[PDB]
Structure formats: C-alpha cells, structure tokens
Ligand binder design. Structure first.
Ligand SMILES: CN(C)c1ncc(Cl)c(Nc2ccc3c(c2)CC(=O)N3)n1
Ligand SMILES: CN(C)c1ncc(Cl)c(Nc2ccc3c(c2)CC(=O)N3)n1
Ligand SMILES: [Cl-]
Ligand SMILES: [Cl-]
Lengths: 4, 123, 123, 4
C-alpha cells in the first residue's frame, strides 16, 4: 500500500 | 482525496480475469476470425480496443453473442493481441510483427501500434 | 517466453472498466446491501473478492441478476470496497475503518483486511 | 514497454  | 493505494491491485484483477477466460467462466461473446473462434469477456475487449468499445456501446451489437471480424484479419495476430489484452504481455516476433500491427490498427489498440512501428523502424 | 510488457496496461484496463461502471455499461448484477443497490460487473467482483468468486462459479447463482448481502453489512463499507475494486484506491478513514474491515472480511478481500488490521494496531 |  502507498500514498498515490 | 485521502485514499491509500494497493500497487498490485490492477495486475491481480487482470490475472484473475485471465484465469476466468482460461476456464471459460462468464465469457459472453465469441470472436470469429476466419475459421477460428475465440471466447472472451465483452468488458475486457472494450477496455482494450477502440473497435470493441464502439461495437459493444452500440444498442444493437451490445446484445450479440457472436462477432465476425473482417476476413483480412489473421487468427494468429488476433490470438497474440487477445493474450496481450488479458496479460499486458505481447509476443512480438519477426515472423508475426506485420500481422500483429495490422490487427492492432484494425482493433484500435494505439499502444501496440506504436511499439510495432518502433520495432519495424529499428529493422 | 520472449514477450515485451506494457507497464500501464492493467491500470488502463481497470480505469476503462470503472468508466463502464460509471456509465452503467454491460453491468450484469445488482448487489443489494440493506436498502442500497449497487450495479457492477460479475467478472470484476469475482476478480476482487473470494465471496463473489465462490458465488458466481456456482452453477445456479452464476445466473442471478440480484445478490442480497447479509443484513449486517454496512452500505457505506460496501461502497468504499466497490470503489477500491474498480480503482485500487481505498478511502480508509477513522470513522469507517471498522465497517470497511468487517465488510472486507465478509467479502474475502485479504489485502484490504491486512491493511485495516495494521492501521487499527497503529492506533 | 519493458522486458518483464
Ligand atoms: C474513450 N472512453 C471514454 C472509454 N470508456 C470506456 C472504455 Cl471501455 C473505452 N475503451 C477504449 C476506447 C478506445 C481505445 C481503447 C479502449 C484502447 C485504444 O487504443 N483506444 N474507452
Ligand atoms: C483462486 N482462483 C483460482 C481464482 N480464479 C479466478 C478468480 Cl476471479 C479468483 N478470484 C478470487 C478468489 C479469492 C480471493 C480473491 C479473488 C481476492 C481475495 O482476497 N481472495 N480466484
Ligand atoms: Cl494498446
Ligand atoms: Cl484485496
């Protein structure tokens, strides 16, 4: 999971 | 927005859609290319091809279970492109590049047409 | 194999599938969550959820146009997860995390359950 | 396009  | 994103989600979705195709699950159309028949999901075809997008947004053609392609279309070129649609992988070879480019131009798959033009220019 | 790969293909497919959903094109099922109704593509639901995968591979349920979820399922939690399925983006917030985790556990969306558990552990 |  990432900060888009 | 303040969303988080799962990097592998789109690839995992496409992998599962290909697993459904390989098991013939919820396929709703057969694409006829000369003598050859290819089963697929209308939504995936539309998501990948400008031609299928135009066909299945048409109020009459959206209900067809069989679509016959132009007799000039090569079944092997179509097979390579159908595999690309479901995997992101293109089996581009010296012996198939002309048939692949012609089929991608007909199917309106802009990114495939661009890489075929570049590979042809290099040779 | 000797394939080449288009990095953005899977993301572009998912983006187009979401465009079809937003325009209600080729949606073949309505998911009922309490009073709320959500239209979707069976194939996308199966590709994202272990629960929908089990439902639509069932010889009888594969033909249903309406699926009613357990009354304990929160419509907002379902909406956030349906948006995630079609975008890879999860709108996870303090006020919805418990409903999102419970819905993801019910839908069998393992990666969403894992990030909810991690975010809850941190607080 | 890349070599996967
Ligand atoms: C253009 N548009 C709004 C849209 N919405 C939904 C879908 Cl499924 C769609 N697909 C599509 C249309 C044109 C093209 C492609 C997909 C690939 C391409 O090279 N051209 N295009
Ligand atoms: C497991 N399998 C062969 C398979 N093939 C096709 C599809 Cl559409 C599918 N989807 C699915 C099954 C289980 C789970 C998911 C999708 C997401 C998850 O967390 N669990 N799973
Ligand atoms: Cl393309
Ligand atoms: Cl997930």
């Amino acid at each position: 999971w990432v900060i888009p | 927005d303040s969303c988080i994103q799962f990097t592998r989600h789109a690839s995992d979705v496409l992998l599962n859609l290909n697993r459904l195709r390989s098991r013939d699950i919820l396929t709703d159309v057969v694409i006829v290319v000369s003598r050859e028949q290819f089963r697929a999901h209308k939504t995936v075809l539309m998501a990948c091809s400008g031609l299928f997008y135009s066909i299945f947004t048409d109020q009459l053609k959206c209900n067809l279970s069989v679509i016959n392609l132009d007799p000039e279309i090569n079944p092997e070129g179509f097979c390579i492109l159908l595999d690309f649609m479901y995997t992101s992988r293109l089996n581009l070879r010296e012996g198939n590049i002309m048939a692949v480019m012609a089929t991608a131009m007909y199917l309106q798959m802009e990114h495939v047409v661009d890489t075929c033009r570049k590979f042809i220019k290099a040779s």
